[PDB]
């Protein structure tokens, strides 16, 4: 039993997977088995969701997070996001679940049966962490794989049914994307936008053409980069900048994933384009705005002139100006005026909310949608009692946006922590003092006193 | 035809359970690795076969 | 809901998503079996 106790490996049971660092075969096993776990949860969770799915209830009333992902891709839904066929959901689930058996098979094999190290077995599959060439090569392979994936999204959107477009004219609907945005000024334009209010960085992408074009770009960039890293070896400045070891690479990737997790948190919290509110429920901004809309509609029906109605503070009760002058909803929701949504935009004119449009053009479907979203705001308790913290039990509801945002903030945080841990440790190990200070060569003892 | 379907699917589940317990046990077993290896090949082929059969019969019962 | 044909497996389906968690616990059973060496 090679390297399977503390005495031989140097690592205690609670750090047992650190025993895998230079055992490429077994490590391969661990990774493929884990991928199996991921695919397994995807499939199993999908089937669970589908079994619990009532098609005439909003998805977001039913604690669903995966079926919304499938539906956003255009599968299973029609106008307004109505479920017209559940079978694609079923397929996605079954196929992931079946595939996880294969992955788990390979993982268990490599982990407890196959060659424990791959280097003597295969120069192709074997690797030394310090071998910068090989590392950048494998990196290259996987970049090519990622590019291929992004291109699969593109292909779905352009040649295999399209995507669900919440902004589709005449109402949300599945639409084939035929003119993706290829202009780099726009695409990387998103990348250079402020992350702050009314800007939102890449989180602000608000049309499917930009999404698709972005994935075209990312696909080509990843394939090119992958080839590049297969064909080259790190330059000198890179060599001198980084730590070259398994734990170092792990630390780098942990940092990356922490960042991505934070980004995704914000994405699901603010964006209603790639996270359609039809499937995920309204965003926080959206529901607050919807309340303002709802009572403007009610009171105006009662005879109120909502344009001239002065609220208690002196600001408009229903309508006021943003700090740059646009007409926006009043009350606390003044904070959310950057919100944009298919149900509200028809009331928007060049200077913001249009009083004439508000007075004459509000449709019943808009009233409905505003009421729905106001009454499904992403607020709720840990035991899924919907509403403000003082609400009585009755409605079983926590928004999927809340579940996704909170989960991925937690995970992103702990992954930042993991990055600090493994980066600091990789530094110390590479320099050779990860196990402690050499008593006979204590560095501070050779330094001049501070005073 | 439905009888065939539920047969094949029940078989798939059972075989799956059997493999789930038996493959790691076999892999980590000192003795009888030859026959075990044979049986893992057999069970794998039969597993793939059953998935394909359930997959096809799906469209003749749903 | 699942297609009618599969409905008999509803209980099984209800239990599947939790299986990954079991693997975590299995790691500990296994370690206890080798005395956490």
């Amino acid at each position: 039993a090679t390297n399977r106790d503390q005495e031989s490996s140097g690592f205690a049971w609670w750090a047992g997977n650190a025993r895998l660092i230079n055992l490429s075969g077994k490590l391969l096993g661990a990774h493929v088995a884990h991928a199996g776990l991921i695919v397994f949860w995807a499939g199993a969770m999908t089937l669970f969701e589908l079994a619990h799915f009532i098609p005439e209830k909003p998805m977001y009333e039913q604690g669903l997070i995966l079926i919304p992902h499938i539906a956003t891709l255009g599968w299973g839904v029609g106008p307004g996001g109505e479920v017209v066929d559940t079978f694609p959901f079923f397929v996605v689930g079954v196929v992931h679940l079946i595939s996880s058996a294969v992955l788990g098979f390979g993982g268990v094999y490599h982990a407890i049966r196959g060659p424990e190290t791959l280097e003597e077995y295969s120069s192709f599959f074997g690797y030394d962490w310090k071998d910068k060439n090989k590392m950048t090569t494998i990196l290259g392979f996987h970049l090519i794989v990622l590019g291929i994936g992004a291109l699969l999204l593109v292909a779905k959107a352009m040649f295999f049914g399209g995507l669900y477009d919440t902004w589709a004219p005449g109402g949300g609907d599945v639409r084939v994307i035929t003119n993706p945005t290829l202009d780099p000024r726009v695409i990387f334009g998103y990348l250079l936008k402020s992350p702050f209010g009314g800007e939102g960085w890449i989180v602000s992408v608000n049309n499917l053409e930009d999404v698709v074009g972005g994935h075209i770009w990312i696909g080509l960039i990843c394939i090119a980069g992958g080839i590049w890293h297969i064909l080259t070896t790190p330059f000198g400045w890179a060599r001198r900048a980084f730590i070259w070891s398994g734990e170092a690479y792990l630390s780098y990737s942990l940092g990356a994933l922490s960042m991505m997790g934070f980004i995704a948190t914000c994405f699901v919290w603010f964006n209603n384009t790639v996270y359609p509110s039809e499937f995920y429920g309204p965003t926080g901004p959206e529901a607050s705005q919807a309340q303002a809309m709802t009572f403007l509609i009610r009171d105006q029906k009662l005879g109120a002139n909502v344009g001239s109605a002065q609220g208690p503070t002196g600001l408009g009760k229903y309508l006021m100006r943003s700090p740059t002058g646009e007409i926006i909803f009043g009350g606390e929701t003044m904070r959310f005026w950057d919100f944009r949504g298919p149900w509200l935009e028809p009331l928007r004119g060049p200077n913001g909310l249009d009083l004439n449009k508000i007075k004459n053009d509000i449709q019943p479907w808009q009233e409905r949608r505003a009421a729905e979203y106001m009454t499904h705001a992403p607020l709720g308790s840990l035991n899924s009692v919907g509403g403000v913290a003082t609400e009585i039990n009755s409605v079983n509801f926590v928004s999927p946006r809340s579940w996704l945002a909170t989960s991925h903030f937690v995970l992103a945080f702990f992954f930042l922590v993991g990055h600090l841990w493994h980066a600091g440790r990789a530094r110390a190990a590479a320099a050779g003092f990860e196990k402690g200070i050499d008593r006979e060569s204590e560095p501070v003892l050779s330094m001049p006193s501070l005073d | 035809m439905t009888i065939l379907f539920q047969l094949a699917l029940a078989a798939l589940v059972i075989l799956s359970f059997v493999m789930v317990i038996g493959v790691p046990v076999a892999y980590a077993s000192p003795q009888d690795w030859d026959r075990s290896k044979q049986l893992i090949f057999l069970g794998s082929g039969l597993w793939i076969a059953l998935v394909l059969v359930v997959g096809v019969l799906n469209f003749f019962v749903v | 809901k699942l297609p009618e044909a599969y409905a008999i497996f509803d209980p099984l389906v209800d239990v599947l998503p939790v299986i990954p968690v079991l693997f975590l616990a299995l790691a500990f059973v296994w370690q206890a079996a080798v005395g956490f060496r």
Binding site: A1 | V25, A28, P30 | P11, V15, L22, V29, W30, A33
Partner: peptide, 29 residues
């Protein structure tokens, strides 16, 4: 509601069962 508990009992035992079988057969744990 019986079948859910039966199933999770079978799966839930399936794990420890592997360990036990291997421990008995003095396998490569």
């Amino acid at each position: 509601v019986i079948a859910q508990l039966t199933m999770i009992a079978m799966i839930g035992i399936a794990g420890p069962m592997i360990i036990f079988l291997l421990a008995v057969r003095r396998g490569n744990l």
